Automatic annotation (TrEMBL), chain C:
It is found in: Virion. Belongs to the parvoviridae capsid protein family. It comes from Human bocavirus 2 (HBoV2). It comes from the Viruses. This is VP2.
Amino acid sequence: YATKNWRPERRHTALGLGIGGEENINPTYHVDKNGKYIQPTTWDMCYPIKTNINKVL
Amino acid sequence: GATGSVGGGKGSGVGISTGGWVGGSYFTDSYVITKNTRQFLVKIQNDHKYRTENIIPSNAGGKSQRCVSTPWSYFNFNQYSSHFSPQDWQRLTNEYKRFKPRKMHVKIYNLQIKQILSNGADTTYNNDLTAGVHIFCDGEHAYPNATHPWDEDVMPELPYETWYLFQYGYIPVIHELAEMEDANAVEKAIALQIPFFMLENSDHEVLRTGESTEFTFDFDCEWINNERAYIPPGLMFNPKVPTRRAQYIRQHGNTASSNTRIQPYAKPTSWMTGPGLLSAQRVGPAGSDTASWMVVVNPDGTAVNSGMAGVGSGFDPPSGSLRPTDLEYKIQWYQTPEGTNSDGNIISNPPLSMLRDQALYRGNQTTYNLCSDVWMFPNQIWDRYPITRENPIWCKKPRSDKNTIIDPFDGTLAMDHPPGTIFIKMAKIPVPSNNNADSYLNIYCTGQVSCEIVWEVERYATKNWRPERRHTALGLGIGGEENINPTYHVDKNGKYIQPTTWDMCYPIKTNINKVL
Amino acid sequence: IPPGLMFNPKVPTRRAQYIRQHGNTASSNTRIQPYAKPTSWMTGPGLLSAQRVGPAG
């Protein structure tokens, strides 16, 4: 993309992810002490499209 | 060998070997070549899965690293005893004033994957001819490093011992942060950023039993200097030649002020003592991480109440080229994994090079007092730590914006890219399970691994008239079950007798003199 | 991670440490813990000691 927008735009970031696990210290998309893969618990953690990049109609 | 002819065909197969045993060293003037073959065993690690768990500490107050454990195993070639026999090491340190690694060649071949069948108390083994083994080299260091200097389970010193590869794992987090006391926003931000690495994210080669693989590496290295200094740089002058320099003595109570010519034996030096930290002392129980000097990183969030002995890594030897005041400042290790409680440990000693045990003394205008911390200062001159055959060769130098002079105090060669670690894993072979589960075929791999290092060396020439110190077998000890067996030999049980002192390990910077 | 944390906590080390005898703690010589592995890499430089002085002007 190229934009003439002056301002910063929304991006997907790891800081929107959650913590989970058996000891609840493990971030999303990681594994816990049992090898369980921690899953996104919300729709934003799955990083949808049509969020970040602006278009001029 | 000599006039030998192998009648195996050029085509690869189950009944054709993929290589042959290499061994021995070859000495020239410009280079030395070491050839080493080992039989290795790879087995299933971590039940075929990635896990992130806290390491349980000892009876000491809990100090725990959080690691990711992987199904993978790795080869570790980093140590001199692995590539040099005691004979070859002796000849290296007696006949050459410097050496460095030049190129490295690794070959993995003659692989065997066998199924482990448990009928009962008896255990049987059958070849799986179609089973593959996954082999991967990380040459760009895209993943966390597998190896750390002075680590155990390095390539066996003696060529006929089996090598049993260790599981690969890495520390994703600082765990005092991963503990996440109450609700802290910065610790939350640290946690959401914890990286996760699977080796499956890259391409690796899969080998069946008739296949082999090879790896090559070119070292770009600084030299390891084997020469010693017989005098300090402060003593190079002529005591009978007068000097133009004058000195002024401030008036003491009973000593008048005076301005006089410097004595011809007292001539001043422009060359400073090398850096080192003598001040701090070790803290806490043995179980906890304990070092006099503790290197920590605290991003935020803490009042640093944690008994930070575990929070930081700890920095030793701190001393550098200063003479260690205590045994606490000396590098010491054990010869075997069964070494315990000052039995089997080797404590490093002064090489008797005049660039090595150094000190500053600060005049208080009555006596001289030892100032413990000598920081980096202009015109400092020193020598690197004298390394024995039991030292690790290299260290991974961490990627960073800025660094000072790189002279690791354990003597290892620190470099941006060391030889890449070879990761090895067996194919993960599922078996059907009527109930929902993950059950796998129980298998293990054995193969031959050969490492060939080319070492660049240089011989010495001296104008010294007198004979010089050399390493000799007469400095070795006797040990064994019957106590008749010399060092570096085997006893009646097959036990290899180990050097019991630091001199028996033949350090460098002992034998060969240099004129400053 | 810091450069002091790059190692494997489950791999044992060859290195040994010596603890000087304290009053209530005896002298001991022991193997370094696999999670306690020592680092060769120092903290960067900086001056924390001094404090600001005088009026703002």
